Amino acid sequence: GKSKKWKEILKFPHISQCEDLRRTIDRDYCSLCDKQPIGRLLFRQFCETRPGLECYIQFLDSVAEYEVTPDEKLGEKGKEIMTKYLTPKSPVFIAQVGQDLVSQTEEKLLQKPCKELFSACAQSVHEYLRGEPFHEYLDSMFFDRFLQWKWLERQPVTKNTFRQYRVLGKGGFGEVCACQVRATGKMYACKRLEKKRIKKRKGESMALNEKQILEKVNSQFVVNLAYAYETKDALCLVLTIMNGGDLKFHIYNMGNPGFEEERALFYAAEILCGLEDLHRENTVYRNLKPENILLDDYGHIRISDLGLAVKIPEGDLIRGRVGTVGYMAPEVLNNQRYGLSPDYWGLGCLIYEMIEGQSPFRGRKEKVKREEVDRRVLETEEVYSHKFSEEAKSICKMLLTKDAKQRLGCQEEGAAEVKRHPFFRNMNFKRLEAGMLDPPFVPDPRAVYCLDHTDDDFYSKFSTGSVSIPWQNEMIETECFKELNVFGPNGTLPPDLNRNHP
């Protein structure tokens, strides 16, 4: 499904083109060998050539598997690792684990096996690879190949890069097309913004804020930005495509008015992770409502409309009285200063509404003016039913606490205080973040879930081009990496990596 000359569009440059890169990129280990998905793969490929480092990569792989193993099938697994990488004469015996380290873990095996038994060991591993092996890789042909991939990443993105298909979505100050990259065939959703209405609205700032926040965050539960290009009378965002309808549709149109508690638990957990990934950047969402929680092809969720989000300066507060009637926290209605707390109020509204099939302050079959809806948020105490377990009631009224200081999650602990709540007592967040828990509803793929110069400066800061992490993932998903990342026969330098003949 790619272009037919895509092997020439993504053709590697000659290594000689990458001297300007090599000179400026920071040689940070956690970036070049872990965060950057293609840098990670290339560094692991480096360790596979040397017999001495091969055993270290395989040990970390086994630990990654151990953090998600079920509790009952856990110690079983712990012994297998103990008797493979850390025995006296093991075939893959790793040395930088001091005899003291192994003795503390082999005795830790006897007690209640923990999911982070090997956390101590794993850090000693990275410590070793951070130094000696990493500096080898920096002077190895694989880093030269990594530099190539960067060169491609930075190539300019235009209208020709993409391929407009259809209007799959609409509304706001623009549309939502379903665009595709001609080169790799990966599908996206383009948030085309009109280039004139932004000028009259003088909202250039919020347009750049949304793009900056999307670029910064890279969560599994929030829509990711991969490209930001300007075009002829439009500035575009290329976001994660979501072909599974919104959560509002599945509460009322599909299924009974509402879900079972176990089904609402799954969505609430994923949404709580999305909010956590945003709060790490002291960024508040302020727009939690069912029609903004979207579902993908597999049954997982992502938060969608960040147009009302802002990045709070650490230690300071904000004042905006924005949002949607019925989903505004009381401190927002009162036009007070707040932090991240509105998002936890919003979470409570979603958990309540998924279980009870209606808003906690508005009856699904009740006609009330907006003023009375607000007063209920500030005064009245919501009521529950037999649909809620004791744990379900608890967390709801805790997240729906009027006083934003006693509200669950609005403390110094953060999202951790919510994951601890007995309502998630049966939720293994560690396996959820790894995508090992089966979503409860799998959408069918055939379904249909229905002129100045002061601006020239603003334009340049916006159209920054491709985003590093999402771009590299695309190259891996589309198998363009597996196909182009070819070297020489019998461990020899390819033509594009030897400097003796350009």
Ligand SMILES: CO[C@H](C)CNC(=O)c1c(C)[nH]c(/C=C2\C(=O)N=C3CC=C(C(=O)N[C@H](C)c4ccccc4)C=C32)c1C
């Ligand atoms: C006849 O029924 C069909 C189902 C019709 N197609 C749709 O309804 C259909 C599909 C398939 N995607 C989407 C939508 C999305 C998506 O997929 N990913 C994302 C990521 C982010 C947004 C987002 O920021 N929005 C906000 C509100 C926005 C504000 C201003 C301007 C544009 C957008 C939307 C989407 C929609 C509707």
